[PDB]
Amino acid sequence: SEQLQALLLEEVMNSSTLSQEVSDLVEMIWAEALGHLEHMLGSPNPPSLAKYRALRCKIEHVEQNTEEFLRVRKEVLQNHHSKSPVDVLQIFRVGRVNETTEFLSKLGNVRPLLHGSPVQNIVGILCRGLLLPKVVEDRGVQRTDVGNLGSGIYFSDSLSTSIKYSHPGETDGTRLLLICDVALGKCMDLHEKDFSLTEAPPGYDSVHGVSQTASVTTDFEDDEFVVYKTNQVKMKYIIKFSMPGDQI
Ligand SMILES: NC(=O)C1=CN([C@@H]2O[C@H](COP(=O)(O)OP(=O)(O)OC[C@H]3O[C@@H](n4cnc5c(N)ncnc54)[C@H](O)[C@@H]3O)[C@@H](O)[C@H]2O)C=CC1
Protein backbone atom coordinates (compact mmCIF):
# COMPACT_ATOMS: atom_id res chain seq x y z
CA SER A 1 0.00 0.00 0.00
CA GLU A 2 1.03 3.57 -0.68
CA GLN A 3 -1.26 4.95 2.02
CA LEU A 4 1.35 3.64 4.47
CA GLN A 5 4.13 5.49 2.66
CA ALA A 6 2.08 8.68 2.47
CA LEU A 7 1.54 8.82 6.24
CA LEU A 8 5.21 8.34 7.14
CA LEU A 9 6.04 11.22 4.79
CA GLU A 10 3.35 13.38 6.39
CA GLU A 11 5.00 12.74 9.78
CA VAL A 12 8.29 14.00 8.28
CA MET A 13 6.53 17.05 6.83
CA ASN A 14 4.92 17.78 10.23
CA SER A 15 8.18 17.43 12.18
CA SER A 16 10.04 19.83 9.91
CA THR A 17 7.67 22.70 10.77
CA LEU A 18 9.97 23.16 13.79
CA SER A 19 13.44 24.37 12.81
CA GLN A 20 16.58 23.26 14.66
CA GLU A 21 17.35 26.64 16.23
CA VAL A 22 13.75 27.04 17.46
CA SER A 23 13.67 23.45 18.72
CA ASP A 24 16.88 24.17 20.68
CA LEU A 25 15.35 27.32 22.18
CA VAL A 26 12.12 25.52 23.16
CA GLU A 27 14.12 22.84 24.97
CA MET A 28 16.31 25.35 26.78
CA ILE A 29 13.51 27.49 28.20
CA TRP A 30 11.64 24.27 29.01
CA ALA A 31 14.72 22.88 30.74
CA GLU A 32 15.04 26.13 32.68
CA ALA A 33 11.50 26.17 34.03
CA LEU A 34 11.62 22.48 35.00
CA GLY A 35 15.05 22.84 36.57
CA HIS A 36 13.67 25.75 38.58
CA LEU A 37 10.59 23.93 39.86
CA GLU A 38 12.66 20.82 40.65
CA HIS A 39 15.04 23.02 42.64
CA MET A 40 12.15 24.56 44.58
CA LEU A 41 11.07 21.09 45.71
CA GLY A 42 14.28 19.04 45.94
CA SER A 43 13.79 16.81 42.86
CA PRO A 44 21.85 15.75 17.17
CA ASN A 45 18.57 15.35 19.13
CA PRO A 46 14.91 14.47 18.35
CA PRO A 47 12.37 17.26 17.72
CA SER A 48 10.52 18.69 20.71
CA LEU A 49 7.33 19.38 18.81
CA ALA A 50 5.05 18.68 21.76
CA LYS A 51 6.79 21.35 23.89
CA TYR A 52 6.66 23.92 21.09
CA ARG A 53 3.00 23.24 20.30
CA ALA A 54 2.12 23.77 23.97
CA LEU A 55 3.49 27.33 23.85
CA ARG A 56 0.72 28.20 21.35
CA CYS A 57 3.25 30.74 20.11
CA LYS A 58 4.90 30.81 16.67
CA ILE A 59 8.72 31.15 16.72
CA GLU A 60 10.85 31.62 13.58
CA HIS A 61 14.63 31.82 13.72
CA VAL A 62 16.07 34.93 12.08
CA GLU A 63 19.40 34.04 10.43
CA GLN A 64 22.53 35.94 11.43
CA ASN A 65 23.31 37.25 7.93
CA THR A 66 19.88 38.51 6.87
CA GLU A 67 18.73 42.13 6.66
CA GLU A 68 16.29 41.59 9.53
CA PHE A 69 18.93 40.23 11.95
CA LEU A 70 21.47 43.01 11.42
CA ARG A 71 18.77 45.69 11.77
CA VAL A 72 17.12 44.28 14.90
CA ARG A 73 20.53 43.59 16.42
CA LYS A 74 21.36 47.22 15.73
CA GLU A 75 18.15 48.52 17.33
CA VAL A 76 18.76 46.47 20.51
CA LEU A 77 22.30 47.87 20.90
CA GLN A 78 21.28 51.37 19.89
CA ASN A 79 20.81 52.68 23.44
CA HIS A 80 23.41 50.52 25.25
CA HIS A 81 24.85 53.44 27.27
CA SER A 82 26.75 50.98 29.51
CA LYS A 83 29.15 50.12 26.62
CA SER A 84 29.50 46.77 28.48
CA PRO A 85 30.38 43.96 25.99
CA VAL A 86 27.26 42.10 24.69
CA ASP A 87 27.17 39.22 22.15
CA VAL A 88 23.78 39.08 20.39
CA LEU A 89 23.57 35.33 19.74
CA GLN A 90 20.18 34.65 18.18
CA ILE A 91 16.99 36.47 17.22
CA PHE A 92 13.51 34.96 16.92
CA ARG A 93 10.30 36.40 15.50
CA VAL A 94 7.51 35.63 17.97
CA GLY A 95 3.77 35.54 17.47
CA ARG A 96 1.06 34.80 20.01
CA VAL A 97 -2.21 33.41 18.69
CA ASN A 98 -4.52 36.15 20.04
CA GLU A 99 -1.98 38.92 20.67
CA THR A 100 -2.01 40.23 17.13
CA THR A 101 -5.80 40.82 17.08
CA GLU A 102 -6.30 42.25 20.63
CA PHE A 103 -3.49 44.81 20.25
CA LEU A 104 -4.69 48.39 20.79
CA SER A 105 -2.64 49.74 17.87
CA LYS A 106 -5.15 52.56 17.34
CA LEU A 107 -4.04 54.41 20.49
CA GLY A 108 -1.11 55.69 18.50
CA ASN A 109 2.43 56.26 19.73
CA VAL A 110 3.36 52.60 19.20
CA ARG A 111 7.06 52.12 20.02
CA PRO A 112 9.23 49.00 20.08
CA LEU A 113 10.65 48.49 23.59
CA LEU A 114 12.71 46.03 25.62
CA HIS A 115 11.47 43.88 28.51
CA GLY A 116 13.89 41.78 30.48
CA SER A 117 12.87 38.61 32.35
CA PRO A 118 14.63 35.64 33.96
CA VAL A 119 14.85 32.65 31.64
CA GLN A 120 12.46 30.52 33.69
CA ASN A 121 9.56 32.89 33.01
CA ILE A 122 9.89 32.63 29.22
CA VAL A 123 7.73 29.54 28.62
CA GLY A 124 4.97 31.18 30.64
CA ILE A 125 5.42 34.52 28.90
CA LEU A 126 5.18 32.90 25.45
CA CYS A 127 2.08 30.93 26.38
CA ARG A 128 0.23 33.76 28.20
CA GLY A 129 1.75 37.09 27.20
CA LEU A 130 3.09 39.60 29.66
CA LEU A 131 0.53 39.79 32.48
CA LEU A 132 -0.33 42.48 34.99
CA PRO A 133 0.88 41.80 38.54
CA LYS A 134 -1.65 41.13 41.30
CA VAL A 135 -2.48 44.27 43.33
CA VAL A 136 -2.00 43.91 47.09
CA GLU A 137 -5.03 44.93 49.18
CA ASP A 138 -5.47 42.71 52.30
CA ARG A 139 -2.20 43.75 54.00
CA GLY A 140 0.12 46.74 53.80
CA VAL A 141 1.61 47.17 50.33
CA GLN A 142 5.37 46.48 50.38
CA ARG A 143 8.08 47.65 47.99
CA THR A 144 8.90 44.02 47.06
CA ASP A 145 5.33 43.57 45.81
CA VAL A 146 5.25 46.67 43.56
CA GLY A 147 7.37 48.26 40.86
CA ASN A 148 8.25 51.85 41.56
CA LEU A 149 5.41 52.96 39.25
CA GLY A 150 2.70 50.69 40.59
CA SER A 151 1.08 47.52 39.31
CA GLY A 152 1.83 47.68 35.59
CA ILE A 153 3.91 46.07 32.83
CA TYR A 154 7.42 47.57 32.67
CA PHE A 155 9.61 48.28 29.63
CA SER A 156 12.79 50.20 28.83
CA ASP A 157 14.26 51.79 25.73
CA SER A 158 17.76 50.76 26.86
CA LEU A 159 19.57 47.43 26.72
CA SER A 160 21.55 48.68 29.75
CA THR A 161 18.34 48.57 31.78
CA SER A 162 17.04 45.24 30.44
CA ILE A 163 20.29 43.56 31.52
CA LYS A 164 19.21 44.12 35.16
CA TYR A 165 16.17 41.81 34.64
CA SER A 166 17.52 39.30 32.06
CA HIS A 167 19.57 37.14 34.41
CA PRO A 168 21.78 34.33 33.09
CA GLY A 169 19.98 31.03 33.06
CA GLU A 170 21.37 28.09 34.99
CA THR A 171 21.05 25.85 31.90
CA ASP A 172 23.44 27.56 29.46
CA GLY A 173 24.26 30.92 31.07
CA THR A 174 22.75 32.96 28.24
CA ARG A 175 20.24 35.78 28.69
CA LEU A 176 16.90 36.47 27.04
CA LEU A 177 15.01 39.69 26.60
CA LEU A 178 11.85 40.46 24.66
CA ILE A 179 11.22 43.15 22.08
CA CYS A 180 7.61 44.35 22.20
CA ASP A 181 5.41 46.79 20.37
CA VAL A 182 4.00 48.94 23.17
CA ALA A 183 0.97 51.18 22.52
CA LEU A 184 2.02 54.13 24.65
CA GLY A 185 -0.73 56.56 23.59
CA LYS A 186 -0.70 59.78 25.60
CA CYS A 187 2.34 59.12 27.79
CA MET A 188 2.79 61.08 31.01
CA ASP A 189 6.32 61.94 32.13
CA LEU A 190 7.04 61.42 35.85
CA HIS A 191 10.07 62.34 37.94
CA GLU A 192 8.87 60.76 41.24
CA LYS A 193 8.01 57.22 42.36
CA ASP A 194 4.33 56.24 42.68
CA PHE A 195 3.80 52.68 43.97
CA SER A 196 0.01 53.16 44.09
CA LEU A 197 -0.74 53.37 40.35
CA THR A 198 -3.05 50.71 38.90
CA GLU A 199 -3.84 52.61 35.70
CA ALA A 200 -2.42 55.60 33.88
CA PRO A 201 -3.56 59.01 35.26
CA PRO A 202 -6.82 60.39 33.84
CA GLY A 203 -6.45 61.39 30.20
CA TYR A 204 -3.25 59.39 29.69
CA ASP A 205 -2.60 55.86 28.48
CA SER A 206 0.87 55.21 29.89
CA VAL A 207 3.62 56.57 32.09
CA HIS A 208 7.33 57.34 31.67
CA GLY A 209 9.71 57.43 34.60
CA VAL A 210 12.30 59.92 33.38
CA SER A 211 15.87 58.81 34.02
CA GLN A 212 17.87 61.17 36.22
CA THR A 213 20.49 63.54 34.78
CA ALA A 214 22.83 66.11 36.27
CA SER A 215 20.47 68.94 35.39
CA VAL A 216 17.24 67.23 36.45
CA THR A 217 17.27 64.87 39.43
CA THR A 218 14.53 62.22 39.50
CA ASP A 219 13.70 59.04 41.38
CA PHE A 220 14.63 56.90 38.36
CA GLU A 221 18.06 55.66 37.40
CA ASP A 222 16.59 54.07 34.29
CA ASP A 223 13.99 55.11 31.80
CA GLU A 224 10.88 53.07 32.52
CA PHE A 225 7.81 52.85 30.33
CA VAL A 226 4.75 51.41 32.02
CA VAL A 227 1.35 50.38 30.67
CA TYR A 228 -1.54 49.03 32.67
CA LYS A 229 -3.39 46.98 30.03
CA THR A 230 -2.11 43.67 28.58
CA ASN A 231 -3.45 44.64 25.14
CA GLN A 232 -1.17 47.65 25.01
CA VAL A 233 1.60 45.06 24.45
CA LYS A 234 2.48 42.89 21.44
CA MET A 235 5.58 40.68 21.61
CA LYS A 236 7.72 40.71 18.46
CA TYR A 237 11.20 39.31 19.06
CA ILE A 238 13.07 37.08 21.46
CA ILE A 239 16.73 38.08 21.75
CA LYS A 240 19.31 35.59 23.06
CA PHE A 241 22.53 37.24 24.16
CA SER A 242 25.44 36.81 26.50
CA MET A 243 27.89 38.95 28.38
CA PRO A 244 31.58 38.00 28.71
CA GLY A 245 31.85 40.06 31.87
CA ASP A 246 29.61 37.19 33.14
CA GLN A 247 32.32 34.48 32.88
CA ILE A 248 34.97 33.76 35.58
N1 LIG B 1 11.11 44.44 33.47
C1 LIG B 1 11.93 45.30 32.87
O1 LIG B 1 12.55 44.99 31.85
C2 LIG B 1 12.05 46.64 33.47
C3 LIG B 1 11.74 46.75 34.78
N2 LIG B 1 11.94 47.94 35.41
C4 LIG B 1 12.32 47.98 36.82
O2 LIG B 1 11.92 46.78 37.45
C5 LIG B 1 10.75 47.01 38.28
C6 LIG B 1 9.64 46.10 37.81
O3 LIG B 1 10.26 44.83 37.56
P1 LIG B 1 9.56 43.71 36.69
O4 LIG B 1 10.27 42.43 36.86
O5 LIG B 1 9.38 44.13 35.23
O6 LIG B 1 8.11 43.65 37.35
P2 LIG B 1 7.45 42.94 38.61
O7 LIG B 1 8.22 43.31 39.83
O8 LIG B 1 5.95 43.29 38.58
O9 LIG B 1 7.64 41.38 38.25
C7 LIG B 1 6.74 40.71 37.34
C8 LIG B 1 7.53 39.70 36.54
O10 LIG B 1 6.63 38.74 35.96
C9 LIG B 1 7.06 38.42 34.65
N3 LIG B 1 5.89 38.00 33.87
C10 LIG B 1 4.93 38.81 33.30
N4 LIG B 1 3.98 38.15 32.68
C11 LIG B 1 4.34 36.81 32.85
C12 LIG B 1 3.76 35.60 32.42
N5 LIG B 1 2.64 35.53 31.69
N6 LIG B 1 4.37 34.44 32.76
C13 LIG B 1 5.51 34.50 33.47
N7 LIG B 1 6.14 35.58 33.94
C14 LIG B 1 5.51 36.71 33.59
C15 LIG B 1 7.79 39.66 34.12
O11 LIG B 1 8.86 39.25 33.27
C16 LIG B 1 8.37 40.28 35.40
O12 LIG B 1 9.76 39.97 35.55
C17 LIG B 1 10.44 48.51 38.22
O13 LIG B 1 10.24 49.02 39.53
C18 LIG B 1 11.71 49.14 37.62
O14 LIG B 1 12.62 49.56 38.63
C19 LIG B 1 11.84 49.10 34.70
C20 LIG B 1 12.23 49.08 33.43
C21 LIG B 1 12.34 47.84 32.62
Author numbering: 316 to 358, 367 to 571
Published text:
PARP4 is an ADP-ribosyltransferase that resides within the vault ribonucleoprotein organelle. PARP4 is an ADP-ribosyltransferase that uses NAD+ as a substrate to synthesize ADP-ribose modifications on molecules. The PARP1-homology region of PARP4 includes a BRCT fold, a WGR domain, and the catalytic (CAT) domain. However, PARP3 and PARP4 contain the catalytic triad H-Y-E but are considered MARylation enzymes, indicating that other structural features are important determinants of catalytic output.
We also determined structures of the PARP4 ART domain alone (CATΔHD), which provided higher-resolution insights into the active site configuration that gives rise to PARP4 mono(ADP-ribosylation) activity. The HD was replaced with an 8-residue linker (GSGSGSGG) connecting L282 to S365. CATΔHD crystallized in complex with EB47, and in complex with NADH, the non-hydrolysable reduced form of NAD+. The structure was determined by molecular replacement using a truncated version of the PARP4 CAT/EB47 structure with the ligand removed. The structure was refined to a crystallographic R/RFREE of 0.211/0.254. The structure of the PARP4 ART domain bound to NADH was compared to the closely related ART domains of PARP1, PARP2 and PARP3 in order to investigate the structural basis for the MARylation activity of PARP4. In the acceptor site, main chain atoms from residues L985 and Y986 in PARP1 interact with the α-phosphate of ADP, and the equivalent residues E544 and D545 of PARP4 are positioned such that they would clash with both the α- and β-phosphates. We thus conclude that PARP4 does not maintain a functional acceptor site as defined by the chicken PARP1 structure.
